[PDB]
Structure 1
Amino acid sequence: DYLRELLKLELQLIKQYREALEYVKLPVLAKILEDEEKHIEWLETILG
């Protein structure tokens, strides 16, 4: 509920970022997706 839209969507964005990486053929996308991944991880761990 609170987190489907804040993390569960983020998962598909990281995933989609890997698709767009190839189409846009730029390592910057991989760096953006990576950096986001850590923030997203903060939600997908939330202390634990």
Structure 2
Amino acid sequence: DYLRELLKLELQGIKQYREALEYVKLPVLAKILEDEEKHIEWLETILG
């Protein structure tokens, strides 16, 4: 469940990054988003 909580936070996090990127085209935000996508993939993997 602790991993599920980290995942849930990561999922909430990306929605916020994506909303900013709807309005401002800042590459640093797309860069962070890219890492968050990987964070999410690793958590899903270790959760099975």
Matched, 1:18 2:18: yes
Question: Greater relative contact order: 1 or 2 (C-alpha under 8 angstroms, separation 6 or more)?
Answer: 2
Matched, 1:40 2:40: yes
Q: TM-score, normalised by structure 1?
A: 0.68
Q: TM-score, normalised by structure 2?
A: 0.68
Q: Higher mean Cα deviation, 7-16 or 19-28?
A: 19-28
Aligned residues: 48
Percent identity (aligned): 98
In structure 2, stretches of 5+ residues that fail to align are none
Decide whether aligned partners of structure 1 residues 47 and 6 sit closer, same or farther in structure 2, where only a CA change above 3 A counts: closer
Structure 2 Cα separation of the partners of residues 32 and 39 of structure 1: 10
Structure 2 Cα separation of the partners of residues 23 and 5 of structure 1: 28
Q: Higher mean Cα deviation, 21-30 or 33-42?
A: 21-30
Q: CA deviation at 1:9?
A: 1.4
CA RMSD of aligned residues (A): 2.0
Structure 2 Cα separation of the partners of residues 12 and 36 of structure 1: 11
